[PDB]
Ligand code: NA
Ligand code: NA
Ligand code: NA
C-alpha cells in the first residue's frame with residue numbers, strides 16, 4: 001500500500017494523530033527539525049521502527065522570516081481574528097515562500113510515485129503548489145489546525161490572493177469546523193475564483209479539489225484511564241491537600257491573546273462579587289505554560305495577565321486563601337489529566353480557537369461517579385461536539401460568571417448526564433475517525 | 449404628500465443629506481438635542497421655515513449608558529472590526545434599549561398616519577421595533593452609516609441576535625455597500641432566521657422588508673465651486689506660502705483607531721526611506737480634529753500618533769523642513785475644500801470606514817486644470833465608486849509608500865484622466881440620487 005508521507009514543522013499532539021498511520025504504511029515524517037544551523041544540509045534520515053523521520057535545519061534568516069515572521073507574526077494573529085496585532089513584511093513573506101520551496105525540493109528527492117502526502121497547518125499553505133511546480137503528481141492533502149478567517153478578515157493579509165490560489169494545488173483540504181470550510185469556499189466563490197460542486201468538491205484555479213471539515217478528536221477512554229492511573233502522584237496529592245474544603249476551577253492554556261485569559265480572570269472576579277458566599281470556598285488555578293516569550297506581543301499579554309492576578313488577589317484574598325493561583329509552568333500530559341480529574345469546573349473560554357482540545361481532555365478525564373462541569377466558549381470550535389457543556393460568549397463577563405456559578409452548584413445527577421452526553425460523541429468521533437476519514441478522502445483522489 | 453420624519457441622534461453632514469426632503473414635505477427632524485438635563489422634558493418644538501425640529505435632552509445616566517456606553521463603546525468598535533476594543537455591559541445595553549423606547553414613545557405623539565419615518569445609524573438599531581410595539585404602522589426606513597460586520601464578528605456582541613431581530617421591524621434597511629448588505633443577509637440566512645426573496649426583499653422574523661445598498665454621495669460640482677471660492681482665504685495663502693517648492697500630501701480624519709493614522713505616518717516614513725530625493729521636497733499635513741477625547745481608548749491612540757509624528761520628524765527633519773505637520777484642530781468645511789485643492793496628494797487610507805466622504809470631497813475639490821491624486825484604502829467603502837483612485841491595502845506599508853511615490857510623480861495627462869474618471873460617477877450617483885433612491889423605496893412600502 002501507499003506510504004503515507006506526513007509533512008509538518010517540528011518533527012503527543014500531532015504524533016498521536018498520525019503515527020499509527022505512518023506505522024501501518026511504513027511511511028515518512030518530514031519537516032524542520034526545530035534547530036537553526038549555519039549552513040543547510042541534506043535531510044537527516046532516522047528510522048524508528050517502521051517509520052522514517054527525515055528532518056532538516058533552517059538558517060537563522062529562514063527561521064526569522066518564515067517561522068517567527070510570516071507564519072507567527074502575520075498568519076497566526078490574523079487567522080485568530082486579531083489583524084490589529086498582525087504585521088506584514090515583504091521580506092518575511094519572501095522567506096516564507098523560499099522555505100516552502102526549499103523543503104518541497106528536498107522532500108521530492110524522498111518521494112516514490114505511490115506515496116500520498118499529508119501536510120499540516122498554516123506554516124505550509126503554499127507547499128502543495130511548490131510540489132506541483134516540481135512536477136509532483138502524488139495526492140496531496142492539507143489540514144489547517146487553526147481557524148480560517150472569513151474574507152473580510154483574510155483580505156487584510158496583503159498576499160492573501162496568492163495564498164488561496166496556492167492552497168488549491170492540494171487535492172484535499174481539511175478544516176476544523178464547517179464555518180472554516182465555508183469561509184474558504186466563500187472567498188473562492190465571492191471572488192469569482194471558482195465554484196462549489198457536488199460531494200464537497202470545488203473547481204478553482206483550473207483544478208478540482210475536495211474541501212471538508214474534519215474536527216480533530218481525542219481518545220476519551222485512554223484519557224480517562226490515564227487520569228485515573230496518575231491520580232496517586234505527588235503533585236495531585238499536593239493539589240488535593242491544598243484545596244481541602246474548596247471547589248477547584250481549572251484553566252489551562254498557552255499564554256496567547258486568543259485565549260482570553262484576562263477575561264477568564266475578570267469573570268471569576270465577577271463571580272466573587274455576585275456571590276460573596278463563595279469567598280474562601282473556591283479557587284481558580286490557571287496553568288499557563290511558557291509560550292513564545294520572545295515576541296513582544298506575548299510579553300505584553302503576560303504582563304497584563306500577571307497584573308490582573310495580582311489585582312484580583314489583592315482585592316479578595318484572605319490570610320489563608322489566594323483566589324487565583326497562577327502557575328507559569330508545564331505539566332506532563334498524563335499528570336495534567338489527573339489534575340483535570342481533581343477539578344470540579346473546567347474553564348475553557350478562548351476568544352478564538354481552531355479546536356480547543358483541553359475542553360475534550362478535561363471532560364474525558366472526569367470520574368463518571370462524580371464528574372466536573374465544562375464551561376466552554378462558543379468560539380473554541382469544540383462546542384458543537386460537546387453537547388452538555390455550559391456554552392458561553394466570552395465577551396459577556398456576566399454570562400461567564402453566571403456559568404461558573406451554575407457549574408459550581410450543579411447537582412450530581414445533572415453533572416453525570418452532561419458528562420455522558422459529551423463522552424458519547426467524543427467516542428464516536430474519536431481521533432482514529434478523524435485520521436481515517438481524512439485519509440480515505442486522500443486515497444480517493446487518484447482512483448481512475 | 450407624506451411628511452418625512454427624520455430620526456437621528458444630534459438634531460453640514462446628515463443635514464445636507466435630508467434637509468431638502470424635509471423642506472419639500474414639510475417634515476419633522478426628531479432626536480436628542482445633544483444636551484444632558486437633570487429631568488426629562490417634553491420635546492421642544494422649533495419651526496425653521498417649512499421644517500419642524502423636535503428635540504429632547506437625556507439624563508447623564510441615559511447619555512452614559514445609551515450613547516457613551518453601548519453605542520460608542522460596544523457597537524462602534526465592533527462594527528469597525530475591532531471587537532478587541534469593545535466592552536459589553538448589561539446595564540449600558542439596558543439603557544440603550546430604554547432610551548430607544550423613550551424616544552419612540554415621544555416621537556409617536558408627533559406622528560400623523562401618513563408620515564414616513566427615516567431613522568439613521570447605529571444608535572437607533574431597535575427604534576423601529578419600539579415603534580411597532582406602540583402600534584405604529586407607518587413605513588419606517590433605516591440607514592446605517594458605518595460598516596455592518598460579518599457574522600463571525602457580529603456574534604461577539606452578546607445581544608446581537610436581539611438586535612438583528614429588532615432591525616427587521618424596519619420596512620427598508622439601507623447600508624453603504626453591497627458587502628454590508630450581504631453581511632446582514634448572511635446572518636439572517638445562516639442563522640435560519642429568514643430567507644432572501646426577489647428584488648432585494650427579505651422574509652425574516654415573520655416580516656418582509658427591503659434590504660439594499662445606497663452608498664452616500666456628495667455634490668461634486670458644489671464642492672468644486674466652494675474650493676475655488678475659498679482659495680483666496682488667509683489660511684490657504686499661509687499653507688501655499690509655507691509649502692513653496694514642495695509637494696503637499698493632505699490627510700484629514702477624526703482621531704479614531706479605525707482611521708489607521710499611525711500606518712499613514714509609517715508609510716510616509718517608508719516613502720522617505722525608499723526615495724531620499726524627496727527629503728525637503730514633500731510634506732505630510734495631517735489634520736485630526738478633536739474627537740471623543742473623553743474615552744481612554746481615544747487618548748491612547750492620540751498619544752501613540754503624537755509620538756510617531758515626533759519620532760519621524762526627529763529622524764528626517766532639517767532646519768527648514770518639518771516632514772509631518774500634525775494639527776489637532778477643525779477647519780470650516782468650505783475652507784477645508786480649498787485646502788484640498790492646494791494638495792497634490794489626497795491620502796485617505798482608513799483601516800475600516802463605512803463610506804469615507806473625505807476621499808470624494810478631496811477629488812471634487814481639485815482644479816481640473818491641475819488635479820491632485822487620490823490614494824485610497826480598499827476598506828474605505830468608497831473605492832468601487834472612485835475608479836481612478838490609487839487603491840491600496842493599508843496593512844501593506846510598502847504598497848502605500850509606493851502609491852504615494854506614484855501619486856507624487858504622476859504626469860498631468862494621467863492625473864486629469866483619473867480625476868475625470870472619478871468625477872463622472874460622483875456626478876451620476878450624487879447625494880440627491882442617494883436620498884431619492886432610498887425615499888422611493890420607502891414610499892413603495894405601503895402601496896396596496
Ligand atoms: Na472527586
Ligand atoms: Na465556530
Ligand atoms: Na495648483
Ligand code: NA
Nearest residue numbers: 625627827829
Ligand atoms: Na468593502
